[model samples]
Target: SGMKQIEMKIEEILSKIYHIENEIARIKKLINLKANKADVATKDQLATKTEINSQMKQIEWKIEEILSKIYHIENEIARIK
Candidate 1:
């Protein structure tokens, strides 16, 4: 019973991770645009972009942390089955 709960939670975490990865991809594009000087990107503009980039990175790290914990739980459940 508890093992099923871990499976469901892992599935949920994976779905959230997929969305986060998509957003990270989008954020990378914006960061690349600023890097390529594709438009009128200023120092301040780049600085703001950098801040956003860092934020997304932090979110990614947190997602990784969540997935890692879920993985551990799944591993522990694995032996029972």
Candidate 2:
């Protein structure tokens, strides 16, 4: 019973970490696009830059939060075993 519980928690943490990693990768691509488009004078480009920056921040925050949770879960697994 104990082992099953620990395994389940670890699996959940891993799943979250995986999703966060994918999101981070997507944000990186967006950041690159915005950086490359920075010199453009169009209003649409400006708006895109702003939106990308905001999305980047949000993705970074989510990654950090997921990492923290993963750390805590690892500690818990160690203690349990």
Best-performing candidate as measured by TM-score = 2
Going through the candidates in order, what is the number of backbone clashes in each? 0, 0
Among the numbered candidates, top lDDT falls to: 2
Clashing pairs in 2: none
* Alpha-carbon deviation at 8 in model 1, angstroms: 0.6
Model 1, position 51: C-alpha lDDT score? 85
Q: Give the per-residue lDDT digits (tens) of candidate 1, residues 1-81.
A: 999999999999999999999999999988776645455667765557788899999999999999999999999899788
lDDT of 1 at 49: 72
Alpha-carbon runs more than 4 Å astray in model 2: 36-81
Off-target runs (Cα >4 Å) in candidate 1 are: 35-81
Each candidate structure's TM-score, on Cα atoms with residue i matched to residue i, is: 0.41, 0.43
